[PDB]
Amino acid sequence: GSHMEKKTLSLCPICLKRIPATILEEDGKIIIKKTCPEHGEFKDIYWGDAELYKKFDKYEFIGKIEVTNTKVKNGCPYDCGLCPNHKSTTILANIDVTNRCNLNCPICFANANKSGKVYEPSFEDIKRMMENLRKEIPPTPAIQFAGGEPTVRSDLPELIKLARDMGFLHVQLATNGIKLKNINYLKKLKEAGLSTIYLQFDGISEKPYLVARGKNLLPIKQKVIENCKKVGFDSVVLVPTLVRGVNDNEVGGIIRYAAENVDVVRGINFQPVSFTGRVDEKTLLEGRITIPDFIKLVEEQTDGEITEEDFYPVPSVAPISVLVEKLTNDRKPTLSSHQHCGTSTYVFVDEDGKLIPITRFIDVEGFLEIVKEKIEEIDVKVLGEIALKLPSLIDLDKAPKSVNIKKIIDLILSVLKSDYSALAELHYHMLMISCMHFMDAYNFDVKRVMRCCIHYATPDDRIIPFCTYNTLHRQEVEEKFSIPLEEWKRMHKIGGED
């Protein structure tokens, strides 16, 4: 019948206490069982496919941190953060610049617009949160403004400039895009130096928007995309909240729409719905979907152009950072998140519009093996040796006709020389297709969250993993630093200015 895979620690979904949990294989799926001393037994889906679950375990990578912000007191996941036992530095920081929003979505992990209180850090508070992120070893390389809807603050372009001034290589905006339907507003974001728009995007028909968002936003999303084309803003990531029964049938359609718009869309990052914050009862009961379920949908709905073997877990590229760090004697941000948190592939869009994953014609598995081997052999000769082996890893038969294989190889080598511009050019050639499954109290796994690489900087000088922030800390923090809406409105204007 069942057989145990792992022991771990989880949370009771009722009282949020830390409780023991078992991860088990059962009928081809991975389940998590747990017991609360007070509220009894719980059973949830952890991963939809036991075979892919075991396959991803081989890419486990344990990171290290040196700069901490909190002490051990109550043990994980209560000591965030970062406490001395966290195993990853910040790769992408989140700063919530507001809890106000110009929407009222039925699915909202932040439960925006319900507290009756306004959380809006000052420009100086945000600079200090950025300093804390930049004090890490290595410094946090990427930051995203979130909330809430960040575009409802009139000072957002100044915050984007500030992030650039503070040294972040990548400045991202998570947004519902509504204000970006005005092209002059989009122009000010580009001019301020925004790297990427992380655009909420739930489908290619009206129904997923009606369900998840409460109204048909599809024409507005389309306008935002057309505005990006008009102003030459070419770095949009579409972000579907993936809900079984709502838009699991539109996975291929979203991917095809991105590929049709690959001049401005650099990726789709699917987010299987996370039962934190605000969720409607049908979503809670019927909507659960996991990373391997998503991978299966991609294969089915792109007619086998993208297959299961094309996806890798995020830490599979941790050794690339390690190697680059050793080659250059400079500490590099390392993607050391848990192997069951997320997955990605990369595809080329050819002339006919067919999707050709880079893994179809580059032996990515073999490439990562050589990388891990050369780390063990660490020097002046490594790069040349790897450059010698790269042709044996390529299948020129399966490569797209519209792709210069020699240029891709050179860009890969330049990434190994710590050329960030080559990594960015590589992303411009391709369409990233990824899926990240943020935890909730039903599937919480302490062994995952200890490796989390996506962190909120808070106004009380903490740095808190995304998955503990949205299950345990968001209300506490927002309540401390909010003022009642009644008084906030009388002291400000709608953009947040005094």
Ligand X SMILES: C[C@H]1O[C@@H](n2cnc3c(N)ncnc32)[C@H](O)[C@@H]1O
Ligand Y SMILES: CCCCCCCCCCCCCCCC(=O)OC[C@H](COP(=O)(O)O)OC(=O)CCCCCCCCCCCCCCC
Q: Does 344 bind ligand Y (CB under 6 A)?
A: yes
211 is a contact residue toward ligand X (CB under 6 A): no
In angstroms, what is the minimal distance from the CB of 109 to ligand Y? 8
Residues 273-332 binding ligand X (CB under 6 A) are: 273-274, 277
Nearest to residue 79, comparing CAs of 341, 443, 468, 456? 468
Q: Using CB distances below 5 to 8 A depending on partner kind, what does residue 36 bind out of Fe ion, ligand X, ligand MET, none?
A: Fe ion
Binding partner at 433 among ligand X, ligand Y, ligand SF4, none, C-beta below 5 to 8 Å by kind: none
Distance separating alpha carbons of residues 185 and 112, to the nearest angstrom: 23
Coil vs helix vs strand at 234: coil
Among 80, 83, 335, 349, binds ligand Y (CB under 6 A): 335
Q: Please indicate if the annotation marks 105 as binding a ligand.
A: yes
Question: Considering beta carbons, is residue 197 or 412 the nearer one to ligand SF4?
Answer: 197
Question: Alpha-carbon distance 255 to 93, whole Å?
Answer: 26
Answer for which of 24, 36, 105, 166 binds ligand SF4 (CB under 6 A) is 105
Q: Which is nearer to ligand Y, 111 or 418 (CB)?
A: 418
> What's the 3-state SS for 193-210?
CCCEEEEECCCCCCHHHH
Q: Which residues of 51-82 are buried (b: 16+ CB within 10 A; e: fewer)?
A: ebbebbeebebebebeebbbeeeeebbbbbbb
For residue 109, state whether it binds ligand X (rule: CB under 6 A).
Answer: yes
Quote the least distance from Cβ 199 to ligand X, whole Å: 7
Smallest gap from Cβ 271 to Fe ion, in A, equals: 27
Residue with tokens 């002046």: 380
> The tokens of 37 are what?
């001393």
Binds 273: which of ligand X, Fe ion, ligand Y, none (CB < 5-8 Å by kind) = ligand X
Tokens matching residue 270: 């699917």
Q: Are strands 18-26 and 3-11 parallel, antiparallel or unpaired?
A: antiparallel
In terms of CB distance, is 31 or 97 closer to ligand Y? Answer: 97
Whether the CB-CB separation of 424 and 24 falls below 8 Å is answered with no
Say how far apart CA 93 and CA 87 lie, in whole Å. 16
Task: Identify the bridge partners of residue 45 per DSSP, sorted by sequence position.
Answer: 31
Ligand-binding site membership of 101 (annotated): yes
Determine, following the binding rule CB under 6 A, whether residue 287 of this chain makes contact with ligand SF4: no
Q: Which of 46, 367, 444, 469 binds ligand Y (CB under 6 A)?
A: 367
Element (H, E) at 497: none
Tokens describing residue 119: 């959380």
Q: Please report, for the chain, how many H helices and E strands are present, in that order.
A: 19, 19
Q: How many residues bind ligand Y (CB under 6 A)?
A: 46
Q: Which of residues 74-93 bind ligand Y (CB under 6 A)?
A: 91-92
How many angstroms separate the CA atoms of 441 and 275, rounded? 8
**Is 83 annotated as contributing to ligand binding?**
yes
The answer to whether the CB of 274 falls within 8 A of the CB of 437 is: yes
> 341 to 360, contacts with ligand SF4 by CB under 6 A?
341
Name every residue whose Cβ is closer than 8 Å to that of residue 329 and which is 6 or more positions away in sequence. Answer: none
Measured CA to CA in angstroms, residue 410 lies from 298, 361, 362, 383 at distances of: 30, 15, 13, 12
| Chain residues that interact with ligand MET, rule: CB under 6 A | 101, 108-110, 146-147, 149, 174-176, 200
Contact between 108 and ligand X per CB under 6 A: yes
User: At closest approach, how far in Å is the CB of 164 from ligand X?
Assistant: 22
Under a CB-based contact definition with an 8 Å cutoff, are residues 449 and 77 in contact? yes
Which residues in this chain contact ligand X in the complex, by CB under 6 A? 107-109, 174, 200, 239, 241, 271, 273-274, 277
Which residues in this chain contact ligand SF4 in the complex, by CB under 6 A? 76-77, 79-83, 85-86, 101, 103-105, 108, 110, 112, 147-149, 176, 337-338, 341, 436, 438-439, 448-450, 452-454, 465-468
Annotated binding site for [4Fe-4S] cluster: 76, 80, 83, 101, 105, 108
Which residues in this chain contact ligand Y in the complex, by CB under 6 A? 91-92, 94, 141-142, 146, 169-170, 174, 195-196, 235, 237, 266-267, 269, 312, 314, 316-317, 320-321, 324, 332-333, 335, 337, 344-346, 358-359, 364, 367, 412, 415, 418, 420, 423-424, 426-427, 432, 436, 453-454
